[PDB]
Amino acid sequence: LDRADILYNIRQTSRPDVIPTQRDRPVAVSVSLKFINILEVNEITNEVDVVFWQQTTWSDRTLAWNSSHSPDQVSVPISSLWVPDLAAYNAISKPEVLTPQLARVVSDGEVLYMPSIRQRFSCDVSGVDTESGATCRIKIGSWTHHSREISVDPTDSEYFSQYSRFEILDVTQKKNSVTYSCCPEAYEDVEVSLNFRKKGRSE
Amino acid sequence: LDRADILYNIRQTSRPDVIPTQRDRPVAVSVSLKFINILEVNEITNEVDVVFWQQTTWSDRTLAWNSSHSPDQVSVPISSLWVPDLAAYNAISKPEVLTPQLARVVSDGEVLYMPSIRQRFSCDVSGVDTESGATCRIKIGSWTHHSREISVDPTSDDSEYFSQYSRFEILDVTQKKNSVTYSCCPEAYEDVEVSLNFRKK
Amino acid sequence: LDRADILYNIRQTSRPDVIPTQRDRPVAVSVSLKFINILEVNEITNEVDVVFWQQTTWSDRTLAWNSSHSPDQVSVPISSLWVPDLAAYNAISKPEVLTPQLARVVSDGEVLYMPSIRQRFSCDVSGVDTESGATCRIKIGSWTHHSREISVDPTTENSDDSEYFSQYSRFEILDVTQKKNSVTYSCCPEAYEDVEVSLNFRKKGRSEI
Amino acid sequence: LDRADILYNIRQTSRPDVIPTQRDRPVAVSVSLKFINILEVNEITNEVDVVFWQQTTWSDRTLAWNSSHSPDQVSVPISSLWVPDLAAYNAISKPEVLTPQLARVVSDGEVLYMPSIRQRFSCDVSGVDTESGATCRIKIGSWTHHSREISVDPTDSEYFSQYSRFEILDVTQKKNSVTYSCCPEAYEDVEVSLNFRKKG
Amino acid sequence: LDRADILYNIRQTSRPDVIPTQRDRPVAVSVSLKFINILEVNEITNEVDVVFWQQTTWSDRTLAWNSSHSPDQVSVPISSLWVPDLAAYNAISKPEVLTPQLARVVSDGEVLYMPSIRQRFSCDVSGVDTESGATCRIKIGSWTHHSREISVDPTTEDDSEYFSQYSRFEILDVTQKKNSVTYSCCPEAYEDVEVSLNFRKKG
Numbered sequence A: 001l002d003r004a005d006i007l008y009n010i011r012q013t014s015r016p017d018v019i020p021t022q023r024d025r026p027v028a029v030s031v032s033l034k035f036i037n038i039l040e041v042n043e044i045t046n047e048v049d050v051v052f053w054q055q056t057t058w059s060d061r062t063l064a065w066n067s068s069h070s071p072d073q074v075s076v077p078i079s080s081l082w083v084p085d086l087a088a089y090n091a092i093s094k095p096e097v098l099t100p101q102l103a104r105v106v107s108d109g110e111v112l113y114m115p116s117i118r119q120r121f122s123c124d125v126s127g128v129d130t131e132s133g134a135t136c137r138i139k140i141g142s143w144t145h146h147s148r149e150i151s152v153d154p155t156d157s158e159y160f161s162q163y164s165r166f167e168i169l170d171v172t173q174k175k176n177s178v179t180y181s182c183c184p185e186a187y188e189d190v191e192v193s194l195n196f197r198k199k200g201r202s203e
Numbered sequence B: 001l002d003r004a005d006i007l008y009n010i011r012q013t014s015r016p017d018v019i020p021t022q023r024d025r026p027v028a029v030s031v032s033l034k035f036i037n038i039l040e041v042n043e044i045t046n047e048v049d050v051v052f053w054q055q056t057t058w059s060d061r062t063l064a065w066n067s068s069h070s071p072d073q074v075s076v077p078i079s080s081l082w083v084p085d086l087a088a089y090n091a092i093s094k095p096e097v098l099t100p101q102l103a104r105v106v107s108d109g110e111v112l113y114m115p116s117i118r119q120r121f122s123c124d125v126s127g128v129d130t131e132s133g134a135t136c137r138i139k140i141g142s143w144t145h146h147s148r149e150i151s152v153d154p155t156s157d158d159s160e161y162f163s164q165y166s167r168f169e170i171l172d173v174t175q176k177k178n179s180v181t182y183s184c185c186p187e188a189y190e191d192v193e194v195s196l197n198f199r200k201k
Numbered sequence C: 001l002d003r004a005d006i007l008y009n010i011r012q013t014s015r016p017d018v019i020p021t022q023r024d025r026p027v028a029v030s031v032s033l034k035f036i037n038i039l040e041v042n043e044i045t046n047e048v049d050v051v052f053w054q055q056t057t058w059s060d061r062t063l064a065w066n067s068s069h070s071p072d073q074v075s076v077p078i079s080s081l082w083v084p085d086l087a088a089y090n091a092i093s094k095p096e097v098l099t100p101q102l103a104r105v106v107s108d109g110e111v112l113y114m115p116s117i118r119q120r121f122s123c124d125v126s127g128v129d130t131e132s133g134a135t136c137r138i139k140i141g142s143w144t145h146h147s148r149e150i151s152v153d154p155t156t157e158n159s160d161d162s163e164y165f166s167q168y169s170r171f172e173i174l175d176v177t178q179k180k181n182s183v184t185y186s187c188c189p190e191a192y193e194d195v196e197v198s199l200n201f202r203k204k205g206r207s208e209i
Numbered sequence D: 001l002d003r004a005d006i007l008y009n010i011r012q013t014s015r016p017d018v019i020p021t022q023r024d025r026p027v028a029v030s031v032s033l034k035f036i037n038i039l040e041v042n043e044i045t046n047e048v049d050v051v052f053w054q055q056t057t058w059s060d061r062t063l064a065w066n067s068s069h070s071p072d073q074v075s076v077p078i079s080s081l082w083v084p085d086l087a088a089y090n091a092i093s094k095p096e097v098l099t100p101q102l103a104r105v106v107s108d109g110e111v112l113y114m115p116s117i118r119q120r121f122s123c124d125v126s127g128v129d130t131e132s133g134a135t136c137r138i139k140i141g142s143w144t145h146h147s148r149e150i151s152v153d154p155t156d157s158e159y160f161s162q163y164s165r166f167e168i169l170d171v172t173q174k175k176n177s178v179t180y181s182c183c184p185e186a187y188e189d190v191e192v193s194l195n196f197r198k199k200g
Numbered sequence E: 001l002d003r004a005d006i007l008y009n010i011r012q013t014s015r016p017d018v019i020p021t022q023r024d025r026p027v028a029v030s031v032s033l034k035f036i037n038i039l040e041v042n043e044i045t046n047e048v049d050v051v052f053w054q055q056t057t058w059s060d061r062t063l064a065w066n067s068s069h070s071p072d073q074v075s076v077p078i079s080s081l082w083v084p085d086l087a088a089y090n091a092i093s094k095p096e097v098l099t100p101q102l103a104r105v106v107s108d109g110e111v112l113y114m115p116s117i118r119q120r121f122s123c124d125v126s127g128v129d130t131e132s133g134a135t136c137r138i139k140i141g142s143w144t145h146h147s148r149e150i151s152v153d154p155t156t157e158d159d160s161e162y163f164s165q166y167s168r169f170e171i172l173d174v175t176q177k178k179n180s181v182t183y184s185c186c187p188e189a190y191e192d193v194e195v196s197l198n199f200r201k202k203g
């Protein structure tokens, strides 16, 4: 098996429309945000612009191949894969995807999709200009798949731009299960708390 | 039947172009707005930005399957389904759809489509900065299907999903159904009018 | 015949690329603007933002069907139909189409396409804040089909204009008049038809807005 | 032959990807700008917004048909035709195409494509608010085809909006052949000089 | 062979999804930015708008043909070719591609893709209005292919030969540099080119 063959088979048998549940257990999706930049904070309106890598991870056995005599990874256009229907509940603009829309697929069926995204959010910006900073919560989960079909779990400003007007004090993640008044089932989400503040001109 | 089979059948026998009338009867569409945020009010120009879930509900028996030993629901791309041609009459921008464009389909043919949308409207913003607030009316109906083909009806805490971080707060939401005859065309067209009473905090 | 059959036939045989001329005579296209809103006037730059329904009407026999025991109308995506290549000559932005892009088709082949459009125009805004108001002319015709292939004609309803106009606009409409022209450009030997819509409007008293 | 047949044949045998060179001669493309409006001048940043018809003209013999008892012209979506890969070198925004993207094709294979375009350019805006006005040069040529494959040649105030804040004093056109440090061949372009000024 | 045949063969067999590695050796990609304009500098927010030609170069043997009695080059839509998944790490907007999306292909399989791009970046704008100017670094590399699949290198071939004389700014110097980076998320190394643009406001 070479790359050409692997990619051909994947394209030929894809089913991007089919959630890869295994024996009616949920697809376990991991989500983690790597913050790159904070761009346009407004303490009056409670709005922020953020750039982040949305590290998204899951398993789709239908993509697996025997890599005994083959590459054990390929990069694949997401239009050829099933992908989780994640959305940020408190986003007030659609995601601006800054990077090539490719996922990495391992021979065992593990998938990693990690685009860089710029997006505007509605959240608590109060205190951004004090020492203890502001804490903005971002809520991400499956739009249409309940907890029996999709579960989401969480996995250092290492990637954060030194040229931002802001700095990161702390990031914490938390998992929730929510029942909305519209539907009888429960839906999982991850809440990411971003604690940040304006740098001093001197800093 | 598994999900793969159900989704394959749906895609293969699509008909996204065909309104699913069970004939002479109109497709009964339910519409309901869950307000999430109010973003950029202008009392001078009478314009507002709103974020809301557009809960849309209808029946399409051509999607039904026997779920005796199968899943009784799947998520489907709306490009593979017939979808009501709803529009907001007083919108002054096209809808910005913020969420994945999937509808939920039940084995009996019930469909739920509920995108989160950001959109700008022309409406009465006067009094927004007073105690009794402003009342902005949003009018939604089928663009091209008359009352014999599509009927729209209204379906809770008005603020249940509303953002606590908005500069505004919701005082009340009321819904109302209308049947309108336009000068251009002989038939009547239904719509729902949603009245959003809100004010600056 | 049911709706599914009618729509299937249309999709399978429609030639969206083919202007439906009958016997070397022009397709008669009717155009009419119903104004919904006037949004962002600038008297310095002579620019206006307008929202309007663009009522467009024509005949295409190739869509016809025998409706003896059938529906006599369906809604059809415009991607499955031939559509006139109308453009606004003095537009300075591309049309923002606000509504579902569907046309209504009658069993005899009559087609009605009427999207709501937001668009910016270059025109005479002078006098907008006076009693007699400004008069902005919008010019619409076929971009590439001459008068022997497409003719454009106004239609005046005999009803009041301001019927669909938003009461919440900062502006108000004094009058709307339509007029047909036939023009020959220096690039081309043939004549091209257009409709000129004259929108007479003014700013509402400032006590109200 | 009727229009339906002509259009069907064109669509079916369409090779939009193939430059229609005849016998190793370059495709001769004519370019001409008809200015409609000047919208948003900035003398500080040297930027202007312009609306113009981009009259583009060339020959593609593979489109020809016998028009003895047939129409001798049709309108065709440009997605079904080869089209020159022209670009404006000093544009700082992508072209906003305002009109239907249709070309006119004559039975002998002559093609005319003339969209109305709004676009922003980087150029010399100094003097715009003086009597002699500013002179803004727009440079247009094939992005990827050299002079042996494509040549560009020149062929307006008649179509200019009376409601613009600006007025046109003069338009001149000029053809150039240029080399670039990246490539050994020569590339043709047209430079259009727009001399304009702010009205009273 | 004529152009029509060459283009037909390429379209029919190209495999835009398949990275053209030759025996486990990485595809060698060359990247070089030719700056055309600097448009909208903001020293407060550390943001700049740049227009540049992104000269991108690589080899794909699967495109080769015998040109004995044929054209030895054609222009090809990039949708019919494999193309490197290059991204600018510090971009804060998606690339606005200003030119026709065509690549030039030589009969031996060499490809040149050079679009003009307008894009906004986050970088160090301090000193832009001084004599020594600001130095803005732009970082470009493969988003998903590691050093064993794609390597990126600067070309060894004027700082402003193509730069607009009508810009409010002027270029003092351009330097390029190659890096190999390991991120915390992944075990492999990823190559990039860092382009340093030293520029200042004209007097």
Ligand SMILES: CCOc1cncc(N2CCCNCC2)c1
Pocket: A142, A143, A144, A180, A182, A183, A187, B102, B103, B104, B112, B113, B114, B115
């Ligand atoms: C079976 C319910 O299907 C749905 C279809 N669209 C949206 C939702 N939402 C409510 C559930 C939680 N996610 C937010 C949107 C649910």
Ligand SMILES: CCOc1cncc(N2CCCNCC2)c1
Pocket: B142, B143, B144, B182, B184, B185, B189, C102, C103, C104, C112, C113, C114, C115
């Ligand atoms: C024959 C009626 O067909 C139509 C096609 N497009 C738009 C409309 N409208 C008028 C009916 C009510 N909705 C507004 C638009 C009607």
Ligand SMILES: CCOc1cncc(N2CCCNCC2)c1
Pocket: C142, C143, C144, C185, C187, C188, C192, D102, D103, D104, D112, D113, D114, D115
């Ligand atoms: C020779 C007819 O071909 C043409 C192709 N595109 C545009 C035009 N125009 C001139 C005729 C009138 N409409 C404006 C543009 C003509």
Ligand SMILES: CCOc1cncc(N2CCCNCC2)c1
Pocket: D142, D143, D144, D180, D182, D183, D187, E102, E103, E104, E112, E113, E114, E115
């Ligand atoms: C082998 C030359 O192929 C090319 C592929 N893309 C762009 C260019 N350019 C440089 C030559 C002149 N046009 C501007 C862009 C050249």
Ligand SMILES: CCOc1cncc(N2CCCNCC2)c1
Pocket: A102, A103, A104, A112, A113, A114, A115, E142, E143, E144, E183, E185, E186, E190
């Ligand atoms: C092999 C890991 O697959 C990946 C899929 N998408 C993005 C990345 N990134 C990490 C490597 C360097 N480029 C940034 C993004 C990695």
Ligand SMILES: *[C@@H]1O[C@H](CO)[C@@H](O)[C@H](O)[C@H]1NC(C)=O
Pocket: C066, C067, C068
């Ligand atoms: C339509 O079909 C019916 C048969 O059901 C036929 O008898 C009738 O004459 C047809 N009408 C037209 C106008 O062709």
